[PDB]
């Protein structure tokens, strides 16, 4: 039943007595449900250390992964180029999923096509699909360039992307001079960030490998910036803003910021902004190339150092205070441009916020997960705040990255209770936050179930989630935030301290029970 | 599909894991293959259910074999067997496992059927291998067919020789309702108020035992015939169970469907149907009186018409000529052109939309979307 | 007792059993506390409509006011001028309080002096205090200007600020040429925003009244901006940024954003930035003057129109979509500068976010309070979002402002259930949110005590507070936020929609109870 | 620094003042000589602030309403006058209490007469009477009302005493007029005195003829603990563990009934001498109740205070005191073991109101830290008499320090840590010197007692050793 003046959505509509009775009748009569005592005892068991030991013995089953597959990152990389259509050679369901994932994170249209490879292609290969798809995509969406990646089906059957595109050009399906860079992006290797790396290396190779004769390092007086897999528009914006304030000529390669943030003015813009083909062609002439997320830009680093002959600096992701300082100082040294007074003042303002919030930040225990570079930058910043990361999870991390993060943790007294986990999922992390409870989690939307589970154990066992990372589906417009530089550090600090203060306010809101500590001033 | 063109069309895996098998709460569904498909489909559909997630229900979870290169090169059958053992260890209260094949399973020669049979015999468990590799077929429709075939072959006839279930003449089964935002619950309350016993309801909020009990019902009420027409015809042929389509979208469709369903039973059921219609008439009438003035005359670009006409909205069937107030038939592309896009089930954020309770929510959402001031702010005053 | 590995602060230390027994013994033995049954009965009575009728009959008692006194606004205005010392003629307790208030809101040093009038001056006047205080302040803190307001003691005694300052100059306590603008700021008239208006009018008069013969309107091709009482640094910053994007010459008179945001670089800067005396002297040469918060800049408006001969445009506070559009169009008309493409795109992005979040925002009920201009801007923006203000409270509002807000509400279908209250305090609003429960409150930190109260009635009756306004004491660095312009509208929208989504996530987190609606995607 | 160096530093700082201000301020700065008993010979206190010098002092209203009367939870305190004073003082002091706010407790609420111009011109006594009626209607469970006068009340010739008498007689309610107008005196100190006199005149003697309270030989009253962050509670649990019955708490978590019961106790344990010595002396001369000063800052002072208090009673209380000390010895010894190595040798400069600048020295020394500078906003010469012995030789003493003076002192002394109020905090954080709020305990605490010592040590360590203090210089500067 519904009152027209106070219409109820599913919650709390299904909490009404009649719906509760109906659901109880369904469960009792036909669901053959386990008794509630059995369910409670099994849940309690899943929160224990013995269950954690069984859980960490897993070698074939993955539960609630913290990663995606390569073509997702390939598509995100392709989106950052001007009038470029991401093109995944393979099966259409993958493209539907990629578009949905990015739509839900960005709340924007996401352009990507497939050549709809099917059983017929599963036998004979995907060459005809490639020819037809390139022709139709160019004719229909009129892109300047088509960036080709693959789904796992095309990788398994071993479709030759180079040969397929060359045959499409030779047979007239697409103009011979039309740019069709490609990358093999197998989903059974690495993760989405590996796909981003592979796609970027493919595009850079396509536009520069054969025309290195006339290239001179430093002749265009610019610094190439490769952002990697990045889902905060504010990070692209802050990098561009800081380089502009410094007076440093730069070339942001793969800039998807505009196309993921088009205005609502009654017109649909398929393409907006993006790195131009001239920029990528001219990239070897840059002074140097800076990789913002080096731990998943290794293939790109190898190509840039070996072919462009750029001395790519050993730089961490510009996250937190020290690493933003190091990034700025390296850029200053490369470009010869001094760090200006505005950036010095911004750094001082971040330090001022740190001093204002240190008492509430100090000693707070965090579980956290995400991509390798983001996770390590967050760990570094948390150490800078006097916080204690305890459970550091990177599902798509590797041994070398774990060793680097362990070195970071050893450099700080605040990392002494921290463990780094690679190849572990969010079910592992659920066990960890039950058995060694942190104060907060930091991660993407998938953490909300863990928090739910912890709350089932008890309000005193609940671990609140702080949403930083990708994807964020259950909040709006957080993709507009910044995590890089002093601005990103300021935003992260504000989020952390105010999450702590909101949790404290909730814990002390009980009239005549805990509200003696419900202070007006914090 | 036509290569090189954008579409939101899913694959067979999206039709089998996403639509048919995934909503079954007390089962564990393994996305067999690389990590992508299970992650993108994880909790992506609002198939509502009641349970303790991770203990006796597993819908919003992502179980996967996370295929690596060595799994591709040497096969994943041993990995699948070890995974089933680990599933048994870490989730002892699961009532069955399904193995939803992703694309590479169909191309590397893996035999999930033999593994399913051996492990299911060993553990005395129902392990359902589904060959729903995404490259099969052109959409999710073939995936629906494959998932329905798996239901028939491995689950549906499990109680063929059992006779211990106490049947009543008022036994119905709700098939093909995926309980999007609780739609199936909103239908089930009306059916039970009619005096019917909903013995089986799947996939939405569905349990494996309910699927097994479906062959014991007197009537099969099918909501989504598109995905669940193979199984309904199979049940009619084998068990002699008649099936009919129902439509609870809007008061007119709901009342007609309730009368049609009650016409299949005795006079007591018809009397209760009349009582239910009488009980709910003032509520949907109040909804109409409140929201039809705010929506009368607005055009919808298009199980389709009913609720829209109950609110006085004209339905139509290039977009700059019709000038539609709303598209019912790519949400963000339409949104960028200043046209709201909405659907029949509240896929994204809201619901239920079915039944009398869902009609109020649907009318409120229609008014909120169509009359929101944001749609009138596309042109800057200086442009 | 304390475990050295896990030390507990007051919460939860006083929840320990021994402390609980101690407190129960204290209450039972010596407090003579009313029985808990009687306390519950009276609380429930305070939640009722009969109590509300009694509460709104108050004529002499004010409980939890939502305003401060004039000298606080005078001090804030004085802080916006370069190397200016706020100087409050009167008793020192007022200055101690003002500095503490602004310290807690901004988490920054706040410079202000008193001449420490005591019982001796209560009969003789504070002329000697003025002479000695001006001399001491100039010698010790070396300001370029001393801006004088009054506490209530000086206003009641009737100290002539002009004569006192003139006698201090005539007797050599300060140089004749040293700028000492003054304003009478009686705390028993108006509120803090009135004090800001009086202080600004005093400074502008001091620097322009006697030099008007050589002034020509529009000769410097600039637009004066008077922000009024503003405690979000982002608002100053966004106005400056938007005017600079337009290529519009401007003078922000009373700009305190630098002095309230000094970096922590090992040096204390008592002064930073601020409006120069040259800018104030050249202000009459502007094309026009725009008042950002007209409803408390009335004395300033009268002076600017009657003396500078500036045709001050009738403009609302640039909050939300429509009023930012009107502000930008008026600025474009005055300056002759077109609105640039960047601002058009920013507006389109605000509209896009509105469209993305309208399903969660539409029909949400809000009780809100604050200063007149801020409150009306917030009401306008909420109406633009499709939200329903229900209880609009402005303690320092007046009848004409209420008429304007009623006209705004009448022009929108979403203002039908809205009532505007002027002269009512936060106890009135507590009754309102009990009797006509909104979904949320939008207000300053004092609203927290209301939320606590509502939670005591029950979780289903709790009204969550959204902290927008002044002062915000229990969260960190919210003073850096923005509420003006498209940027401010986007920030407010994000805060509102994510408050709604956070509340929904909290209500649907119950395992097997409400978590059927705990959607990953929102 | 040697004594001559501190004298030179004082003179160098003083040289920027005009001759009148410099000559005045010279008498309020001193170099400590721990042997000297009469602090008048070296320093001067409780004088008027110099105009325009950015003093840190508050007013009499802050001393009376904000300090003494406001914490009393079951009374309703009216900020009588214009809106400002009550609003700036609302819930800014962490005087913790247990109650149902708005029903039976009213501490964090702001009740005010909100004076307008007509109230100023024609008086506000009728408005006050009407306000008292409205308070009675809307808060029936209040157990009394106080009327804290703000500055205009004493300048417009309002008679709040006559209104208090008439309305209190009519309503059978205790209504306490307090003439704590901000222009009275020179600081919060006279506010303390006025509030104490109001307590004596209107509340304390209410049960003089009532002999129905069952008294015990172990009846004590905690006077002058305002329960900042729970400080008083952390003290109370020790006294109750010692076998004493704490009849009254003044005024943190205080109720009007325990104030009325205070004349029945056997001992008055005064923590803040400065704010409550007046009422303690009055109670001694009227009822014969002895009073003693105690200090629960740090384990050393706490143990000494517990033994000194227990010596006022029979051997059973002394045995229980020894048991309490033995029970808590391992906990604070573990706290010391954890935190003293991280804090040994660090130097502290303090500037707080009336009691803590000398009271917290022992807690700092229990962690291996040395207090090199201390000072008071509003202490009297008797407070400085108790500070010379407690501070190191050739250490800085400053009375009613100006912001400029304290900044210059900190620049030349360079302490590792400063403890002062919210007005100094961000100044000294900007300079990169770790700062701890010594009024609100930086929204932490309690710091009293053994339980409070663990929190205090954790807080001092987390602030002094925070990584942020190593980052104030940019690596390219
Ligand atoms: S199954 Fe089909 S796309 Fe028939 S794949 Fe799809 S829950 Fe749609 S129009 Mo999502 S053929 Fe069902 C459908 Fe219809 S997932 Fe749901 S709404 S009635
Ligand atoms: S009452 Fe006094 S200024 Fe003794 S007015 Fe002040 S809660 Fe201070 S040094 Mo704030 S004489 Fe108490 C004090 Fe000490 S408010 Fe508190 S910390 S021990
Ligand atoms: S059509 Fe369908 S969704 Fe596509 S793969 Fe095939 S079953 Fe799956 Fe999977 S991991 Fe990523 S998303 Fe693909 S490339 Fe493979
Ligand atoms: S010294 Fe003390 S705080 Fe000052 S007024 Fe006097 S009692 Fe009060 Fe009050 S309303 Fe504002 S803050 Fe003053 S100017 Fe008057
Ligand atoms: Fe969007
Ligand atoms: Fe600060």
Domains of chain D: 1-59+342-476 (3.40.50.1980), 60-202 (3.40.50.1980), 203-317 (3.40.50.1980)
Q: Are B200 and B183 contacting, i.e. CB atoms less than 8 angstroms apart?
A: no
Which of A319, A138, A156 is CA-nearest to residue A228?
Answer: A319
Q: Do A386 and D467 touch (CB under 8 A)?
A: yes
* B307 given a catalytic annotation: no
3-state SS, residue C369: strand
Tokens 């921290």 locate to A418
Taking the centre of ligand 5 as the mean of its atom positions, its distance from the CA of residue C357, in whole angstroms, is 9
- Site to substitute for ligand 2 among D72, D107, D353, most atoms within 8 A of C-beta: D353
Q: What is the CA radius of gyration of chain A?
A: 25
- Strands D267-270 and D219-225, by their bridges, are parallel
Say how far apart CA B106 and CA B99 lie, in whole Å.
Answer: 13
Q: Which residues contact D233 (CB under 8 A, 6 or more apart)?
A: C14, C19, C22, C23, D96, D227, D253, D446
Best of D78, D87, D325 to substitute, by most chain C Cβ atoms within 10 angstroms, is D87
Listed in sequence order, the DSSP H helices in D28-141 are 60-61, 83-88, 117-122, 125-138
Residue D386 known to be catalytic:
no
Question: Cα distance from D238 to chain C (closest Cα, Å)?
Answer: 10
Listed in sequence order, the residues at least 6 apart from A509 whose beta carbon sits closer than 8 Å to its beta carbon are A515, A518, C451, C452, C455
Chain D segment 272-311 residues within 8 A of C by beta carbon are none
The answer to whether C13 and C19 are in contact (CB under 8 A) is yes
In 3-state terms, what secondary structure has residue A84? strand
Both tokens assigned to B186: 């909103």
Contacts with D239 (C-beta within 8 Å, 6 or more apart), sequence order: D220, D222, D246, D269, D309
Q: Coil, strand, or helix at residue B57?
A: strand
State the pairing for strand pair B63-64/A62-63: antiparallel
Strand partners, A84: A145
Contact call for residues C70 and C185 (beta carbons, < 8 A):
yes
Domain with CATH 3.40.50.1980 in chain A: 69-214, 215-319, 364-469
B158 at interface of A, judged by CB pairs closer than 8 A: no
Q: What is the SS3 assignment for D411?
A: helix
Cβ neighbours of residue D314 closer than 8 Å, sequence gap 6 or more? D217
Does the C-beta of C273 come closer than 6 Å to ligand 4?
A: no
Contacts of D30 (CB under 8 A, 6+ apart): D42, D43, D396, D397, D398, D399
The Cα A279–Cα A262 span in angstroms is: 22
Query: CA A91, CA B3: separation in Å to the nearest integer?
Result: 10
A25, B175, B184, C19, D368 from B203: Cα distances, Å: 18, 7, 10, 54, 69
Q: Where in chain C is the domain with CATH 1.20.89.10?
A: 320-363+484-522
Rg of chain D on CA atoms, in Å: 23
**Residue D42 assigned ligand-binding role:** no
Phi first, then psi: give them for residue D451, nearest 5 degrees: -60, -40
Sheet holding A113-114, edge to edge: A113-114, A84-89, A145-150
> How far is residue C147's CA from residue C165's CA, in Å, rounded to a whole number?
11
Q: Which residues of D touch A351 (CB under 8 A)?
A: 468, 471-472
Token pair in block for residue C292: 């950002």
Which chain A positions have a beta carbon within 8 Å of D455's beta carbon? none
Q: How far apart are CA D233 and CA D252, in angstroms?
A: 9
- Specify the 3-state DSSP secondary structure of C276: coil
Rounded CA-CA distance D331/C283 in Å is: 67
In chain B, residues 316-355 whose CB comes closer than 8 Å to chain A: 330-333, 335-338, 350-352
Using an 8 Å Cβ cutoff, are D229 and D446 in contact?
yes
| E-strand stretches of A334-386 | 365-369
> Within a 10 A sphere around the Cβ of D144, how many other Cβ atoms?
22
**In angstroms, rounded to a whole number, what is the distance separating the alpha carbons of residues C80 and C276?**
9
Going from the C-alpha of B42 to that of each of A187, B65, D104, the distances in angstroms are 17, 14, 52
Residues B34/B41, Cβ–Cβ less than 8 Å: no
Resolution of the entry in angstroms: 2.0
E-assigned strands of D298-429? 347-350, 370-376, 396-399, 417-420
| CATH value of C69-214 in 3.40.50.1980, 3.90.25.10, 3.10.310.10, 3.40.50.150 | 3.40.50.1980
- Cβ atoms B97, B123 nearer than 8 A: no
Enter the CATH code of domain A215-319. 3.40.50.1980
Decide: B147 and B21 in contact? Cβ < 8 Å: yes
CB contact at 8 A, A53 and A432: no
Give the count of beta carbons closer than 10 Å to the beta carbon of residue B5.
Answer: 18
- Tokens encoding D244: 């004493």
For B7, residues 6+ apart whose C-beta sits below 8 A from its C-beta are: A92, A96, B1
Distance CA B371, CA B383 (A): 23
Phi first, then psi, for residue A465 (nearest 5°) are: -95, 135
Give chain A's largest Cα–Cα span: 82
Three-class SS state of A238: helix
Sort D205 into a burial class: Cβ within 10 Å, 0-12 / 13-18 / 19+.
middle
Euclidean distance between CA atoms A442 and A456, whole angstroms: 19
Catalytic residue among C77, C112, C137, C152: C152
**What DSSP element (H or E) covers B280?**
helix B267-295
| CATH number at C364-469 | 3.40.50.1980
Give A-chain residues touching B83 at CB under 8 angstroms. Answer: 60-61
In chain B the first and final C-alpha atoms are separated, in Å, by: 40
Tell me: cis bond preceding B203? Omega within 30 of 0 counts. yes
* Catalytic residue flag (residue B14): yes
C328's tokens: 């930008």
In order, the DSSP letters of A167-203 are HHHHTTSS-TTS---B----TTSS-HHHHHHHHHHHH
Query: Which token pair is D465?
Result: 């050793």
| A489 closest CA partner among D431, D471, C109, C493 | D471
Neighbours of C221 (CB within 10 A): 12
In CATH, the architecture of A320-363+484-522 is Up-down Bundle (1.20)
Q: D448 Cβ partners below 8 Å, 6+ apart?
A: D225, D231, D232, D234, D235, D296, D297, D302
Pair type for strands A84-89 and B97-101: unpaired
Instruction: Print burial letters for C325-359: b (CB count within 10 Å at least 16), e (below 16).
Output: bbbbebbbebbebebeeebbbbbbbbbbbbbbbbb
Kindly tell me the sign of the dihedral angle through the C-alpha atoms of A68, A72, A73, A79: negative
User: What single DSSP character describes residue C420?
Assistant: E
Residues D443, D464: Cα–Cα separation, whole Å: 17
Q: How far apart are CA C275 and CA C289, in angstroms?
A: 15
Residue D352: both structure tokens together = 């707080």
Q: Is D177 in a helix, a strand, or coil?
A: strand
Angle at B199 between CA B195 and CA B204, to 5 degrees: 110
The count of other CB atoms within 10 Å of the CB of residue C166 is: 13
User: Which of C391, C467, C496 is CA-nearest to residue C436?
Assistant: C391
Cβ neighbours, 10 Å, residue C245? 16
Q: Give the bridge partners for D258, in sequence order.
A: none
Could you tell me which of A185, A188, A187 has the C-alpha nearest to residue A200? Answer: A185
| Helices C192-208 and C70-79, packing angle to 10 deg | 50
- Cβ contacts (< 8 Å) between B379 and chain A: which residues? 265-266
| Nearest-by-Cβ selection for B43 from C362, C363, C520 | C520
The two tokens of residue A154 are 């095309």
> What single-letter DSSP state applies at residue B134?
T
Q: Which is nearest to C448 in space by CA: D90, D138, D444?
A: D90
Rounded CA gap, D140 and C42, in Å? 8
- Tell me phi and psi for residue C82, to 5 degrees: -65, 130
The three-state secondary structure class of B291 is helix
Residue C469: closest CA among C401, C373, C360? C373
Q: How far apart are CA C402 and CA D383, in angstroms?
A: 54
CA distance A316 to D229: 43
CA distance D327 to D306: 13
Query: Which of A455, A477, A516 shows the shortest C-beta gap to C494?
Result: A477
- CB pair distance less than 8 Å for A132 and B55: no
The CA distance from A259 to A102, in Å, is: 12
CB contact at 8 A, A393 and D466: no
**Distance separating alpha carbons of residues B36 and B64, to the nearest angstrom:** 9
Q: Find the radius of gyration of the CA atoms of chain C.
A: 25
Please answer whether residues B148 and B175 qualify as being in contact, where contact means their C-beta atoms are separated by less than 8 angstroms.
no
Residue C401 structure tokens: 């402002």
User: Are the C-beta atoms of residues B303 and B321 closer than 8 Å to each other?
Assistant: no
End-to-end CA, chain C? 45
Tell me the C-alpha distance between C232 and C219, whole Å.
32
Q: Please tell me the distance from the alpha carbon of residue B150 to that of residue B58, in angstroms, as a whole number.
A: 19
CA A301 from chain centre, in angstroms, equals 20
C-beta atoms surrounding A261 within 10 Å: 21
């Amino acid at each position: 039943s519904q009152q027209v003046d106070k219409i109820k959505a599913s919650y709390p509509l299904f909490l009404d007595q009649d719906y509760k009775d109906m659901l109880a009748k369904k469960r009792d009569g036909f669901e053959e449900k386990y008794p509630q005592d059995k369910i409670d005892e099994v849940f309690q068991w899943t929160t224990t250390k013995e269950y954690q030991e069984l859980n960490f013995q897993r070698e074939a089953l993955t539960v609630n992964p913290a990663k995606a597959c390569q073509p997702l990152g390939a598509v995100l990389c392709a989106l950052g180029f001007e009038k470029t259509m991401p093109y995944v050679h393979g099966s259409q369901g993958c493209v539907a999923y990629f578009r949905s994932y990015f739509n839900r994170h960005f709340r924007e249209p996401v352009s990507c096509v497939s050549d709809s490879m099917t059983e017929d292609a599963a036998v004979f290969g995907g060459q005809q699909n490639m020819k037809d798809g390139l022709q139709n995509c160019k004719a229909t969406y009129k892109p300047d360039m088509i960036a080709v990646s693959t789904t796992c089906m095309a990788e398994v059957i071993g479709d030759d992307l180079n040969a397929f595109i060359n045959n499409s050009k030779k047979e007239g399906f697409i103009p011979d001079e039309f740019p069709v860079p490609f990358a093999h992006t197998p989903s059974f290797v690495g993760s989405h960030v590996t796909g981003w790396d592979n796609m970027f290396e493919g595009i850079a190779r396509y536009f520069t490998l054969k025309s290195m004769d006339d290239k001179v390092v430093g002749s265009n007086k610019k610094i190439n910036i490769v952002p990697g897999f990045e889902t905060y528009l504010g990070n692209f914006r802050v990098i561009k803003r800081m380089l502009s304030e410094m007076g440093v000529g730069y070339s942001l390669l793969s800039d998807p910021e505009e196309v993921l943030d088009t205005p609502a003015d009654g017109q649909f813009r398929m393409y907006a902004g993006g790195t131009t083909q001239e920029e990528m062609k001219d990239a070897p002439n840059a002074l140097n190339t800076v990789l913002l997320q080096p731990w998943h830009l290794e293939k790109t680093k190898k190509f840039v150092e070996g072919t462009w002959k750029h001395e790519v600096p050993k730089l961490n992701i510009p996250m937190g205070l020290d690493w933003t300082d190091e990034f700025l100082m390296k850029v200053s040294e490369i470009s010869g441009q001094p760090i200006p007074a505005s950036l010095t003042k911004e750094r001082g303002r971040l330090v001022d916020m740190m001093t204002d919030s240190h008492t509430w930040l100090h000693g707070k225990r965090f579980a956290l997960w995400g991509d390798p570079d983001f996770v390590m930058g967050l760990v570094k910043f948390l150490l800078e705040l006097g916080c204690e990361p305890v459970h550091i999870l990177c599902h798509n991390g590797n041994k070398r990255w774990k060793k680097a993060v362990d070195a970071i943790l050893a450099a700080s007294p605040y990392g002494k209770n921290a463990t780094v986990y690679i190849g572990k999922d969010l079910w592992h992390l659920r066990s960890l936050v039950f058995t060694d409870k942190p104060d907060f989690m930091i991660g993407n939307s998938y953490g909300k179930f863990i928090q739910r589970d912890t709350l089932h154990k008890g309000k005193e066992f609940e671990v609140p989630l702080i949403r930083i990372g990708f994807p964020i589906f259950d909040r709006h417009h957080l993709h507009r935030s910044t995590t890089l530089g002093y601005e990103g550090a300021m935003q992260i600090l504000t989020t952390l301290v105010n999450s702590i203060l909101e949790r404290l306010d909730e814990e002390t809101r009980g009239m005549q029970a805990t509200d003696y500590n419900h202070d007006l001033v914090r | 599909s036509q290569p090189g063109l954008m579409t939101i069309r899913g694959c067979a895996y999206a039709g089998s894991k996403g639509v048919v098998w995934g909503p079954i709460k007390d089962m564990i569904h393994i996305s067999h293959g690389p990590v992508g498909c299970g992650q993108y489909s994880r909790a992506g559909r609002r198939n509502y259910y009641i349970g303790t997630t991770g203990v006796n229900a597993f819908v919003t979870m992502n179980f996967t074999s996370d295929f690596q290169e060595k799994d591709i090169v040497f096969g994943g059958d041993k990995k699948l067997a070890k995974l089933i053992d680990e599933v048994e260890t870490l989730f002892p209260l699961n009532k069955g496992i399904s193995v939803q094949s992703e694309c590479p399973i169909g191309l590397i020669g893996d035999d999930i059927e033999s593994v399913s049979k051996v492990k299911g015999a060993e553990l005395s468990k129902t392990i359902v291998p589904v060959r729903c590799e995404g490259f099969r077929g052109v959409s999710q429709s073939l995936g629906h067919h494959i998932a329905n075939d798996a239901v028939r072959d491995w689950v549906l006839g499990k109680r063929d020789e059992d006779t211990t279930f106490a049947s009543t003449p008022y036994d119905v089964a709700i098939i093909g309702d995926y309980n999007i935002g609780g739609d199936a619950w909103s239908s089930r309350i009306l059916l039970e108020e009619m005096g019917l016993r909903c013995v089986a309801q799947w996939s939405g909020d569905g349990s494996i035992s309910e699927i097994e009990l479906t062959p014991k019902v007197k009537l099969n009420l099918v909501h989504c015939y598109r995905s669940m027409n193979y199984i309904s015809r199979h049940m009619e042929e084998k068990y002699g169970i008649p099936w009919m389509e129902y439509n609870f979208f809007g008061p007119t469709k709901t009342i007609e469907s309730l009368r049609a369903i009650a016409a299949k039973f005795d006079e007591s059921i018809q009397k209760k149907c009349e009582e239910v219609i009488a009980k709910y008439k003032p509520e949907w009438e109040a909804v109409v009186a409140k929201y039809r003035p705010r929506l009368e005359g607005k055009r919808v670009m298009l199980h389709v018409i009913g609720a829209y006409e109950d609110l006085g909205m004209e339905v139509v069937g290039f977009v700059k000529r019709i000038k539609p107030d709303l598209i019912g038939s790519e949400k963000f592309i339409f949104q960028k052109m200043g046209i709201p896009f909405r659907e029949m089930h509240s896929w994204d954020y809201s619901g239920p939309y079915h039944g009398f309770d869902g009609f109020a929510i649907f009318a409120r959402d229609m008014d909120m979307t169509l009359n929101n001031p944001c749609w009138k702010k596309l042109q800057a005053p200086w442009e």
